[PDB]
Structure formats: C-alpha cells, structure tokens
Write a structure and sequence with these properties.
This is part of a larger assembly, with two copies of chain A (100 residues), three copies of chain B (566 residues) and one copy of chain C (101 residues).
Chain A lengths: L4 H21 L6 H17 L4 H7 L13 H4 L2 E8 L2 E8 L4
Helix pairs in contact in A: 1-2
Chain B lengths: L4 H8 L6 E3 L6 E3 L2 E2 L32 E10 L2 E10 L2 E6 L1 E2 L9 E2 L5 E4 L4 E4 L1 E7 L4 H8 L2 E7 L5 H5 L5 H12 L5 E7 L5 H10 L3 E5 L6 H14 L2 E5 L9 H8 L4 E3 L22 E6 L9 H12 L7 H10 L2 H12 L5 E3 L11 H16 L11 H11 L1 H6 L17 E4 L10 E4 L2 E7 L13 E4 L5 H7 L1 E4 L1 H5 L2 H4 L5 E4 L20 E3 L6 E3 L2 E2 L18
Parallel strand pairs in B: 3-5, 4-9, 4-10, 7-8, 11-12, 12-13, 13-14, 14-15, 15-16, 16-17, 17-18, 23-24
Antiparallel strand pairs in B: 1-2, 4-5, 5-6, 10-19, 19-20, 20-21, 21-22, 25-26, 26-27
Chain C lengths: L5 E2 L4 E3 L6 E8 L5 E4 L11 E2 L8 E3 L6 E4 L4 E8 L5 E2 L8 E2 L1
Antiparallel strand pairs in C: 3-5, 3-8, 4-7, 6-8, 9-10
Classes of the chains: A alpha+beta (100), B alpha/beta (566), C mainly beta (101).
Bound molecules: nickel (II) ion (NI) (6 copies).
Chain lengths: 100, 566, 101, 566, 566, 100
C-alpha cells in the first residue's frame, strides 16, 4: 500500500470515529473526543466521494446536535478542522460552530 | 480611551477581579493581581506589538530573555496573578511586564531579536508536577506522566521485575548506574530511590554514593525497627530522604513501634491512608507528627461509589489471595477500609496530608496525579463549602492548598525545591500551559527547561497545526542532545563529589539534592496541620479531637467522561 | 492511461558489436542440470560439460547480460561465445587462469 | 546477436528514444542518452553479471565504489539519461558504466568485493528535494518530508510556539544552539534561519555566529525598511541568505518602498504570489528584479476549484478574523486573490518563479512540495501545450525546468549547492529511487549520504520484504551514529570559525554555506525569466508587457485520489 | 513438617520428577534435579523470605549478586534443573541456592541490599536464542527477533538494497563501519558478515580488519571454487567463520567440486536442505562431512501440507520466473523438492543438522526460529516416538537436542560461545523467562546483559501492569547508554587490534570472536551425527546407508492459531 | 493478549481494509491502497478459517474486478502478497494478477 506517516495518522482518526459511531448508535450522548472524531471522519469520507470544500463546510454542521452531546461539548468545539485528499488533492475543511 | 472588561478579557485574557472555572469542576479562581500597564500589553502577530522598534527592542542576547510567555494567568502556591513570564538560559528570569524599555513603561522582561514568544493569553500557566512515588516498571511511564503535566519523577526500580512491581527501590550500585544512564533518554527530570532495608549502614552508604537521592523502606524487604533506624542514620549523615511503606502485618510492632524507631527523624510516609500499604488499620495517625511528611497515592482519591469494589479486588489480585481463604479475606478487609479512604479526602482539605503521588502501576495511575488532586478539591468544596482561610467569593485558597500537593511540597520533601516545584526566579523553566476548559486534564503545551517537550499536534502534513487527528507528540525538547540540556538528573552530594556523572558519562544537566533532613511538617506549603488523630481498632473510625472525620462517595466526577475517549 | 507506462521505440538492439565470436558444441555428460550465466569464463564451466575448452579460452556466452543457458542431463547444444574485453584478465572461476588471457 | 527493444526495456529499463509516463500525469520523458555498452549491462542476482571475476573485479576497497545503482534512468536539471551511478565515501563518484575493467569495456565505475548494489532497472533516480520554507513546528515533519523525497530542510523555529507557528525564525543563540543539537536526531540535512527583524546589527551578527545560515524578515516581527536594510547589511558581511515575508499591510510603504530598502541586494522572497504573505496586492512584481530569488509555497499550487474556498477560510482561522467584521473581511479579500493565484502557475511555467517550497504547517504542506510541483507541470502542459524551449515529441525541457525548482535552485539560493541539490560528482549521495507509476508521490528508496534512510517495508516477520502491510519505515541510515555520518548540519562561516560544532558537541558531519550573496535570478537553472510584470490596484489582474497572465482551475488532478488512503 | 507435592508445585514451581507440557505441543519435560534445600526456598513479597536479616543478608554489593531469578526451571543443553540463578556485573554468577548465609544453609547465591529479584517460580528459563542467518534488510528485525526470545543476531547487509535482499553480506569497510555504528542502536548482540566472494585475498582481509566476524560466500556474487578457496584461506589466517550458499546452478561444478574446493576446512553451510539455495538437488549431502556445520533456515521447518505450494510460488516471485517458461519452471522444480524438505525434519531429529536459523526476509521468518524448532520436535515425537538416547518417561533428551540448535551450536559455529549461547557461569546474562503455556511462542521477560530489555506490558496508566492491552514494549535495557552497557558488538581479532571500536566511537561493550576454525561437526552439542547420506539424481530420494529418510506433512501444528491474532 | 510487533502491524492492515470495505459498499471505485488492503485482509481471514494456500491463491483473484477499481489500478497491482497464521503456522500467499 506504501502507506506514508500521514495516511497511518488518518487511520487512527478513522478508528476513533468507529468508537464514536457505535456509541451514538447505542443512544449515548457523545463526549469531546468522540464528537471531534465523528465529525472529522464524516468530512474525510465526503472528500473521498468528491464533495466540494464549500459543501462539506456546511454538511459538517449537521452531523451532531446539542441533544446528542454531553453538556459543554458544543462550547468546547468552536470549530473542527481536517484535511483530506479531494479529487483535486489535499484540502483543508474548517467546520465552524459544528454543534448547535 | 476605554475598552469594556468583556472585550479586554477576550483579547488579553482575564484581569483583576475576573473569575475562571477550572475545567468542568465547581472550582472558580479569581485574578488577584495583574502586573501589566493597561494599553501596553504585548501580543504577537501580524500588525501586533512584538515587532522591531515597538514591543521588541535593540538589545543584545545577554540583555533580553530567550522566551516570553505573554499574558499568562499564573496559578501557583503563592498567588493567582496575571503576568508575562520571562525565561533565560532555561531558567525563570522574571514574572512581570514584558516589552521594549525604549518605548514602553515599567518593562521588567526585555524582549529582543533573541526572544521567542509563547502566547499565553486566555491560558492558565502552572509549574510542572513532581511525582515522588514512581515505580520504574517501564520507560513509557515518562511520556505518560509528562503528557499529564508532570515534569519530575522520583522513584525506584529496574523494569518489570518482582522487586520493582512491589517497591520503589533501585537495588545496588550496578542497577543504580544503569538506571541513571537510562534516565538521559527520558524527557522528565529524574531522581532515584535505593533499597533502604538493611541493618548494615555500609550497604546503604554504597547506594547513596552510587547516585540515589533517597532510600525506600518497604515491608516487602522487611520494614523492621532495625532497618528503619539504619536507613535514617545514613540519611542524616548523607542529606538524602527516607520514604516509608510500613509493616502492614504489625509483625515487628504496631504503628507506635515504627514511630519509636523513627525517633523524631524526618521521613516521607507513602500512601499514609494505608490502602496502598502500612500498619493496619492505623498508619493514618502518622500525620499528627512534626517530622513526618505524609503523601497519598491516587487510586483512593477521591472516595467514589466504585472505590471499595475496585480496591478489594485490585489487592486480591496483586497478593494472589483467593476469596475462599478466611485469613486472606481477613487481611484484605484489614487493608481496604471505607473509614480511612473517606477520612483521607477531608485530611487533604484540612492540610493534614501534604503531598499527592501516583504509586505508578503498583496501585496507582501515573497519568492521574493532577486530575485526581483536582477531583478531591471539587468533592471537598461540594461537601464542605469554603475553607476557613478563604477570602472573597472564589476558591483561590483551596486552589493554592491543592496545587502545593503536587508541586512545591514533593520538591521540598525530596530536597530539590532549589531547582523545581514552583514558578520562581532562578528555578528551572518547567512550565505547563493549560486551556481553562482542559485545566488539570489535557495541557496545551509542556515546557522542559525552556524548550517545549510535548504538546498536542495535528496532522503533520496539514497546512496548519490544528487539523485532526490531534494527539500528544514529543517535541524538540524531547530529542537527543536538546533533551539532555533541558532535563536534570538529581544526584546525592556523595555521588556528585565522587564524580559519578563523569564516570557513567551522564549527558544531562546534573542537580544535587540538599535539605532533606531539615524539612518538617511545618514547612509544607499550606498543608502544615498536625491533627490530634485517632483510629478505633474495632470500627476503624477516624477521629480528630474526638470528632468523626468522614465523607460521602461520589457517583460522578468532573475531569472524567467529558474528556477521555476510553 | 496506465501510470508509469513505457512507449518503447520499436526496433532491435545489437549486442556486443565489434567483438570476436565463436561457436562450440556442448554436451552435458553429468546426471544433474547445469546452467551457465552470460559472463562466466566458458572454458572453466563444470567439467561434466564436454566441449573444445581450448577454443573457449577467454570467451563467455554471447547472450543478453544477466541471462543464462541451461543444459539438462544429456542435452547437447551449439552455443555462441563472445571474447572477454577490457584488460582480458581472468581471475576466479575454477582458478585455471588467474591472470592475463 | 539482437534483442527486441521491448524485451530490452523489460530486462534493463528504457533506453535512448523510449518514453515513460510520469505517474498518472500527461507528462512524458524521453531517454536522451544511455551510457552503457549494449551487451555489457550489469545486473545483480542468481547467475547474473555482478559476480567474482565477471562484473565484479579483484580491486581493493580504495579502487572500487561502495555502492552502485545499476541501470538507473536519471532525471535531473542537466539531462534525462540512462546510466549506472557510483557512490564512494557517501558522495557521488561517477555517472557512467559500471563493471569490471578486467573483462568489460568502457568501465568508469569499478565494482569490487567492497561494492553494495541497488537495482535501479526500470526505476527513475533523482536528487533529494530541498525545502527552504520549513517552520520547525514539530520534529515529525522530518520523516514526513523524507518520505516525500525531500532530503534537506532549511527553516526556523523552536517547536509549537506562537513565534514559530507564524515565522521561520529560530531566535537567539540559546534556541539556535538547542535546535542545532536537536538536528543531530533527524534523518534530513538541516540549516537554520534566525530572526532577521532588528535595527541593531550586532543582535543579528550574534545569531549568525551561533550557527544560522540565513535570517528571516517576517512582517509579524516588523518587516520595515530599517529592519530589511539591517539584515541585508549583515548578510553581505557574513555570507548568509536573507528570506523575506514582506509588509502585507503596506504599513511602512508599498512594494516599491520594500524594493528601495533592498537596494539591489540579494534576497529570497517567500510565497511571492502573496497568498502566504506580502504587500497586498502586488508582491508578485518582485519576480521582475535581478537580485530577487522568488519562491512559491505549495497550497496555491496548482490553482483548483477548491483553492479559494479553502484559503479564504484557512487565513480567517489563522488570524482569528470572524466573517462579521467588514475590515477583517476586507483584509482577507486583499490577501486571497484568484488573479494572482492563477497567474502564479503560468509564472512557474515561464521560469519567472524559480523555487517551490512548503511553508510547513503555517499555510503549507510538508509532504507535498514535490507532488504539487508536478501537478503544476501537468496543468500547464494541459493548458499551454509545449514550452518554446521544447525539442522532440516529449516533455523533457518542462521536466528539467520543474525539477530544478525543488532541487538545484533552493540549493543555489541558500549557498549549499556545493554539497547538495543535484546528481553531480563530489556532491553528497542524497538520491531518491522512484517506480515510474509512483514518480513524485511514493518513492521506492530514499538514500541519505550513501545509506538507505527510509523505504517502504512489508511485514517484518514475513519470508520476503514485500508482503502486506507495506508502509514507510526508517532504515539504518536513520539510526544513531550511522545517521550522524550520513546527514549534514549546515553552519555559517562565522559559526564554523568560532568552533560551534565542537562547543555544542554536534555529532553529524558539518557543511558551511557559501555564495549566498553572489547568486542572482540569472543563476536560477532554467528559471531565469525577469518579466515586465504589473498588478492592477483595483482589479488585481496580472499582466506581462500588457498581456493578461491567467489560468483555469483544475477540477481533478493526477497524483491524488489514485494513490492516497485518505 | 510435610507439604503435598501438588501444593509445593503451586507455591514454588515443579520439583524433581514433576513433568511440564511445553506450550500446546506433545512434548513433556521432567525436572531432573533441584538445587534447593526444602523449606529454605526464597520467595519475594509481603511477609515472605527475601527480607532484611531473613533471606536478605548484610553483605556489601561486592559480596552479593545484582540480580536473582528465584525458583527457575532451567531448560538448557546440559540439563532440566530447578534452581535459583544469580547475575552479577551483567554475567551469570552461579546456578544454585540463593539466600542469606547468616541464617540459611547451603547458600551459593548471596542476596543483599544490592540485589534485585525476578520471580521465576512456575516459569521456564532458557538462554537467549542466537540467529546466524540474518539479512539486515531493516532495523525493525531486531525488536521482532528479541520479542521471539533471540538475543544475538549474526548476519550481513546494508538495508533494503538488492545485494542484502539476496545475501547476508555487508560489503566493504565503509558499509561495515556504518553498520557497526548503527548496531549500537539495537537491543540485540550483533556480529557482521562481509562479502566473501573474491579471488584476491587482500579485498577480504580489508573487510575482516574493518570488523566482520565472518565472510558469506553466496552464489549471487559467484560461489565458484576459486572464491570459496580464497575466503577459506583468509578465514584460516584471521580466525573468522565462512558461511556458504553454494552454486545451485552447478555452473562451476557439482556438490563434490564445492566439497573439493573446501578441502576439509571448517565452513557453516546455510539452508543445507537446499530449498533456500545450494547445489541442486544434493547440497544436503554436506552433513556427512566432519568439517561442515550445517544449518536449516525456517520456512521448510516442519514439513506441512501448505509448504510446497507456498515455496514454489515464493521462489517464483523472488527470481521473477513466470510459470510459462519451461526452463524457469524446470529451475523452480529443481530447487523445491518434497523429498529433501521431508528428509530435513528427520535429519534434525537424528542430530545430522545442528543449527536452526531464519534467513530473515529472504526466504525466512525472523520471529519464528524458536517456534519452528519446537514444531519440528513435536512433529518428530508424533512420527518417530522416543529417541534412542531417551531415558525416562519424558522428552528431555529430544528437548536438549533441539534447544542446542538455536543456542549453543550457532554460538560455537561463530566463535562467540565464550560470551553467549547457554546458561553457564561467566557468560553474558541473556536470559528468557517463559510461562509454560507460552513456551517458545511469547516470552514473559527477555533479559539482555542483566537488564530487562523487552517484556509484555499492559496499560501504562493502569493501577497494575497487567490490564489490557498487553503488548511487547521496550524496557530500560533497550534505552540509550543502558542498552550500550547491556549488549555486545562482536569484532574480529584484527579489527579489535586495529582499534576499530575507538575509531568509530562504538559505545557498546565489545567482544572478540575466537575458535571459528577449530570447531567441527563432532563439537555440535547433541547434534554430531555424520550420516552416510545420498540423494538420487532422478527421484531426489534421500537415503542414509540405503534406507529412505522421509516424513509426512502436518495438517495442523501447535504454537500456531491458539496464540496469534493473525 | 501479549501482542507481538507483527500482530500489531497486521491490525493496521485490518483497519485499512475496513476503510476500503465501507467505500466499496458506497459504490466507489477503489484506489491503489484500498484495493491492496481489501484483498490482503480477505486472504488473512481465509487463513484464519483454515483455507489452504492453493485455494486462497485462486479465491484472492475474485475479490475485485476492473469495474470496481479506478483506471490503472489493475496495472499498478501485478500481485498481492500477505502472510497469515494458517492451522499449520505462518504461510505466504501470493495472488497473481488479482484484478481483471
Ligand atoms: Ni507501598
Ligand atoms: Ni509503591
Ligand atoms: Ni510568510
Ligand atoms: Ni512561513
Ligand atoms: Ni542463501
Ligand atoms: Ni539468506
């Protein structure tokens, strides 16, 4: 596969998002790292699908709501940032105030 | 012109009278003082203050600091103050007002071409934690402690061997020499403890001369009156500390007999509540004594609804007891006691217990000394309300009392407070920068000797350092020769005089311990209480002047599920 | 589109141009297979290969560099040889030359 | 006898006239020359050529190379040639024909008992990349760059501190000394940049004498005419380079004022298009000047449909702007401009911009300098067709023009082209071996100073090195004392004369920079164009001799989703 | 008073006459002797024996051991004995009875204040494995071998280069010097092999003088009679070993011709069965010779139902054969032969093959030398029953015969048995502690030179070292200067005399090889058989004195799916 | 679990194959590392099930077709190799020309 360190680092993020996805499916209110991982992995999959940076900056705000996360988590996350390989190379996606 | 206090706080961090919640606890700190001149704050960035001829002056390197932490909210045993911190030659240079004396007033921290900037506006800055109950079971404990905000580790061991799994002892000159050599590789300051259990003083003097800064007396090597007496006699000759895990079994005598053997000499009592070890059921009575520096280990901190169940079973597994043997069950029940575990939290709140520590991977969690100290402070504020020493509508005195437990008090106990343990001029610049929402749980930056040693770091290939995944990664302060310059290996006076550093080719900066014998309970910063304490032999009830000392177990704690993935 | 694909210029490459060559008939009289590489000193091959060793002195197989010729037990072939170049000094093999020639 | 050209290419790699596609781009290289004698190629293996008395001779170690890369297809600024490469004492010995002079003709690279073999048939071999805009935010950037094919990193910083997050500056002797010590631990050649923003020349001379090979002038430390003049005066005295990030805010003057302060002296302008920083909107006009060596940073390379959206937001987050403040919005819109971002790609194709770099973790991607350089070359071939300099039905001249941007041109700019930057006799053997399908994206082998430093490696316990998972792992060239022998730390002439290497106990080989002041635009290999360039103040349109310079944004790029897991 | 044997075994480990199953195999060991005095066993813990004035004495460090492994069940070539093992100054001090001579009888291993304890009750302790067929393809192989219980690695290479992918050769002084420098970083003892294929003896003498402890003759560099003769002439002059991978192609002669070139001189034949390389189809006949020390590589050990399919394809991929070329197919079929692969297992059982090795990442698995040795012993017990040498209802002699294959016999072959290879007084304390259920598969503790170097370790932040996830992590014996003190780099006598260690600044302890030339088949511990062996040229059938030597392929093996996650 | 480095290395491969499995399930054409991971993990599970090396050398060729992968991916993968613990120990499986 000739995985570079950056690709191996993203595998860690994908795994942390699997933990969060299973907890959200059990109906738990997610904590700080679960929430960050879940939204970040969602953006990476959107980039793999060929969605635009502009589209994902908006789609990222509809992954989790205040009722799905623990008290104070939305305030702990003013933004989520992640880079992914889009059809036109690596790009940075910033999701502002993702949880409302 | 004027700026609103809310707009000021957003731009430069809080100022005098503003309050900040510590993480998700009920603890609130209030800014007591601010060393700035309003309008003259230094901020770094595009079109900002720290620029040539502006906040940055024309001075040579000898005339300016190497590093400035701007607009820091300092939390230390001595105050909760807003200030700039200057670092020069890896040491704290000044706490005050940074800038350029050519154009700014009241500058005490000159910034020049040779100055690096750490932006601390909106952050809390504390001294690095000092853990004095480390079992050197594995070297991975160093990064785990450093990530938690602990910059100095004192303990003993040789790796995952039976002796080290049970005790903080590095036995003999050969292993002491090998562990001092291995310490150069770790990004924490280290001091070693030798095996103190012997009745021949020359076998102890050889270990001190090899490099140990203290001796551990542990019941697993025989914590008898003769061994304790021998170690204390050597400690008094050689200016090193003695750490004690007393005779739980009461084989050689009861707690009064161990206290008689100590004979008023200075000693650090580990896990003083006794669940971690010690005369059953009354080792806790040692905190009444002026010569005893008492610490707690962290699994019993604070008392929770899962404490007794985890401990009764944790002990049963360590000692290979099996719940079918009545005498093994009678032993387990004599060591794990709800009465002393609940009293311990109150004794910390009153300042009768002076230090907190881990007991790393031997009935203790290396990455939780700081987190658990704050969980106790929270639980005590909830249950007890304001301390008698408290002034104002804040928790400042309680915060100063508790931060001293993992910073200055361990440093004073082990004779290293001349180098580490607090944010004070001339001390090593071991500093921790915290975002208030993550205070005590996940630091923003950990600085060792003036260099950043570890920090959260996002995707290495990203266009900025913040994109996911963000996780703790070692920095330049943790690499080869830079790490050697930025960490200390502590040695005894005998080892330093005998040229141990040169003989072993130790690469790190060396510091020598001093003042282990003169330190007493009265010297424990904000934690000098000597209560008239008793333990009932039948009920295990702890009383101070006849009054029952107890607390209620927590169901849920702050600094827990909101922060951690597992 | 094939990543890193070649667009080879069609044609042929002539190997070992301008060098002296000869042909020898070789038979494997052994009961085990023998395979000889392109640069081996042909006169010093396994003694079970029977041929004119005097004619082969200072020659190697005239085949693409790195390839080999296989002789199964009892197999007979006529091989083409090409003379060694450079200093024409042979060292190694069965230690029959160990110097110029 | 004869062999078909297809069979020859399969066995030994392509020869004269054969073409190879670069990865999944539309770029095709043609073999210009082949240094072999047909029939005498050296191949290693069972029954192959490199064997005792055959392709391997009887010479002593002093009389043969230590390493031979066989049948390599060399791609460098000087040609696209098929040859064997000989390495001796960690340096390039010869480019030619390998073998044994005892039995083979035309041997220029003798192979003996002392010779190791790297099989390069069917591979492309290039010099190691040179990235001159590194922010030393974290040490993990070194392995990330090395994996991408970058063997030399020039930059500044002290770790994840505010100063370094914004600027490539290692401020002052203390931090310069610590970073030189930390550099010994990293498997890349390193040179440091100091903080150039001061108006007192002695504060700059102290940093050069401490070890920096250049000074960075950054607007965040005040890029005023007086600071620029001071740094250039010192640079002219001390033979070091000056790197510039100009005054975006036009606070001290406009681009013409900065050019007047420079006064025709040599300077390297970072992110010359200006999205990464510089006089808004016209810093791009600096590429008209003979004394300016202009580089681009990589996020704007090439122009894509997601560029503007990512950048407008990337900048807004870095500077904490908030889209509700009209003046912060007016600032963001003055820095991020479709007109200059699109012109930049054309200016690279014309050879008006001479270098590419990262701006690592500070509006730049450390592992993408090479990949993005080739993406620009592809996009320019698609949009512009053949260059005027192109001869033949191939892209050889465009390939030579672009490879020079990350190899020889950064080396010439920073005064290290006597040691690194190209495959040339006497230079350090920093070589990258690429499979053509993965050219510019994922290398087969990365060699530092004659040793393999990093390579893809399969299961360690497998019977062969190819089974999954295959991922990049550090090799022997990246371990302790072997790494020290195989990497260089670059120092200024003043630091080398003052015995800095001995004082700091630096373990790596030392090289000294020279020729930073005499290098000019005319010296930039294949990239010496000085266009008559203008930027309209109202529209931001870039024109050369009145002609609009623009390009169209890519929807999809090569060297992207086909290769990367994320 | 009396204790039942079952209760004794549970408390102190098995004693004389008790049997233990090795992992999940059908092999049973019986305790032959016990060096203790019943009632005087030393156990460490709360209220246990090793305490001041009890099992721990008052002696100075010079008068007690640094480390004691208590109640170990020793398994070595010389016996299966229950004893305490004492370690002093990183070397084996004694095997016997530990304790305090002041109060205990028959003490031969004094315990004092300077003594660390490893609890070995219920564990099997063996010498560290010695792998002599290492290809230094990547440095990650060191940790992989160490985890498997291998503490010494002899081999050659320079990283993932064509030469090293095929052969165990470190070519020339420059690469030998770099690899000796890189070896300081690895937690295994290392010795290097040079390239032996040359007909000029001075090119070989230069490599030995640079540091190699042996020379490898490989067919890929030309395994001709002249090259073999030259290497053996140099080996006889310089006291180093010669390793051989013979001419598979029979290009220069048949196996008899190689044996004539050897001329009765000492040589180590690698992969003697021939699937890994060598005269086809009869290299296996070399084990009849008194001067030949024959080893097997591990992929053919033991013969299984998947062996031929994996190998035929493994070879086809390595050599780039393609199943469409009749001659490439004829070559593959001449090397991979069911007849020799099946005979090899029997030849190991009879003691005709003396060593096992990996051939790491070049048709061999670095982490499976030990596991596969035991799988062969199991398969041979199942198929052949008791050995003729067997006494008692146990497998003790078979166990001693097989453990010698990866411990003492490789050490004797390479002239390092004066330092490593067995648990014997004065040898380096390289010891492996195994839980019987995981014997040969997953060790409990790996000790290098008296320090624990690697061990399974649970959650670093846990209250005890056992909670999940438990995985192998490097310990203090693998860190910087402690690692240097605890490992050996082996050098030739010429390199040691020429001051190579000082010139290269090698940091590790140095050992010098001796006795490589005088070792013969008769010296191979329990594996000295010289059978009258023949191989039929047409059928490949292996016969000893006319009797067919064969075995049946395993469907399922022990030490496999029960233990490994993948 | 006493996981050795080789077992931890295979966990990375298993994770990369989970990423690929989810992308193939969304109907995406897989790229080079996704394709290698997916087929390699399939072989490792076959070995755990007790399939023969010969059987898996053939089964591995029917995991992905040319229509399920990006252009040029089949040419980028002339073979896939992976070792796994079979009932009879570690064995190497080579899948030749896996995608057609
Ligand atoms: Ni204790
Ligand atoms: Ni403890
Ligand atoms: Ni910039
Ligand atoms: Ni920058
Ligand atoms: Ni071999
Ligand atoms: Ni081999």
């Amino acid at each position: 596969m000739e995985l570079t360190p950056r690709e191996k680092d993203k595998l860690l993020l994908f795994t942390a998002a699997l933990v969060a996805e299973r907890r959200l499916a059990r109906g738990l209110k997610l904590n700080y790292p679960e929430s960050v991982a879940l939204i970040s992995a969602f953006i990476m999959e959107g980039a793999r699908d060929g969605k635009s940076v502009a589209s994902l900056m908006e789609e990222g705000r509809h992954v989790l709501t205040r009722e799905q996360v623990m008290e104070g988590v939305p305030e702990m996350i003013p933004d989520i940032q992640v880079e992914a390989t889009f059809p036109d190379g690596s790009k940075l996606v910033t999701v502002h105030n993702p949880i409302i | 012109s004027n700026i609103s206090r809310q707009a000021y706080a957003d731009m430069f961090g809080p100022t005098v009278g503003d309050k900040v919640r510590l993480a998700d606890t009920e603890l609130w700190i209030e800014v007591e003082d601010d060393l700035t001149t309003y309008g003259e704050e230094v901020k770094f960035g595009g079109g900002k203050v720290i620029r040539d001829g502006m906040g940055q002056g024309q001075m040579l390197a000898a005339d300016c600091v190497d590093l400035v932490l701007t607009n820091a909210l300092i939390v230390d045993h001595w105050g909760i103050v807003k200030a700039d911190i200057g670092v020069k030659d890896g040491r704290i240079f000044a706490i005050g007002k940074a800038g350029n004396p050519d154009i700014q007033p009241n500058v005490t921290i000159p910034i020049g071409a040779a100055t690096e900037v750490i932006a601390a506006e909106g952050k809390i800055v504390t001294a690095g934690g000092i853990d004095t109950h480390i079992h050197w079971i594995c070297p991975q404990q160093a990064e785990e402690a450093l990530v938690s905000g602990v910059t100095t580790m004192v303990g003993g061991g040789t790796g995952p061997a039976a002796g080290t799994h049970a005790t903080t002892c590095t036995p003999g000159p050969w292993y002491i020499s090998r562990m001092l050599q291995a310490a150069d590789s770790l990004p924490v300051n280290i001091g070693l403890l030798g095996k103190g259990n012997v009745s021949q003083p020359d076998a102890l003097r050889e270990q001190v001369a090899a490099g140990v800064i203290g001796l551990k007396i542990h019941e697993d090597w025989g914590a008898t009156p003769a061994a304790i007496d021998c170690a204390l006699t050597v400690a008094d000759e050689m200016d090193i500390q003695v750490a004690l895990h007393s005779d739980t079994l009461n084989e050689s005598g009861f707690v009064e007999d161990t206290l008689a053997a100590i004979g008023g000499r200075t000693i650090h009592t580990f896990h003083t509540e006794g669940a971690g070890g010690g005369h059953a059921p009354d080792i806790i009575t040692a905190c009444a004594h002026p010569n005893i520096l008492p610490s707690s280990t962290n699994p019993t901190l604070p008392y929770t609804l899962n404490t007794i169940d985890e401990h009764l079973d944790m002990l049963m597994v360590c000692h290979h007891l099996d719940p079918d043997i009545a005498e093994d069950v009678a032993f387990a029940e004599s060591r794990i006691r709800r009465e002393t575990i609940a009293a311990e939290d109150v004794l910390h709140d009153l300042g009768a217990f002076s230090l907190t520590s881990s007991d790393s991977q031997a009935m203790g969690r290396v990455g939780e000394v700081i987190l658990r100290t704050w969980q106790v402070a929270h639980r005590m504020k909830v249950q007890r309300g304001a301390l008698a020493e408290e002034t104002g509508d804040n928790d400042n005195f309680r915060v100063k009392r508790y931060i001293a437990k993992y910073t200055i008090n361990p440093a004073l106990t082990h004779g290293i407070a001349h180098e580490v343990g607090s944010i004070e001029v001339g001390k090593l610049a071991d500093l921790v920068v915290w975002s208030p929402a993550f205070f005590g749980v996940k630091p923003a930056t950990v600085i060792k000797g003036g260099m950043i040693a570890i920090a959260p770091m996002g995707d290495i290939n990203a266009s900025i350092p913040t994109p996911q995944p963000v996780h703790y990664r070692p920095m330049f302060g943790a690499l080869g020769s830079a790490r050697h310059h930025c960490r200390l290996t502590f040695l005894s006076q005998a080892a330093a005089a005998n040229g141990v550093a040169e003989r072993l080719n130790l690469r790190s900066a060396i510091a020598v311990v001093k003042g282990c014998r003169t330190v007493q309970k009265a010297d424990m910063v904000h934690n000098s209480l000597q209560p008239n304490i008793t333990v009932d032999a039948q009920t295990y009830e702890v009383r101070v002047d006849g009054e029952l000392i107890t607390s209620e177990p927590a169901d849920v704690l702050p600094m827990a599920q909101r922060y951690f993935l597992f | 589109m094939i990543p890193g694909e070649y667009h080879v210029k069609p044609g042929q490459i002539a190997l070992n141009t301008g060098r002296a060559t000869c042909r020898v008939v070789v038979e494997n009289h052994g009961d085990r297979p023998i395979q000889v590489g392109s640069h081996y000193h042909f006169a010093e091959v396994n003694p079970a290969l029977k041929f004119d060793r005097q004619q082969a002195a200072g020659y190697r197989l005239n085949i693409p560099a790195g390839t080999a010729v296989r002789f199964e037990p009892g197999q007979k072939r006529e091989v083409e040889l090409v003379a060694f170049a450079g200093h024409r000094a042979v060292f190694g093999f069965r230690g029959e030359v160990m110097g110029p020639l």
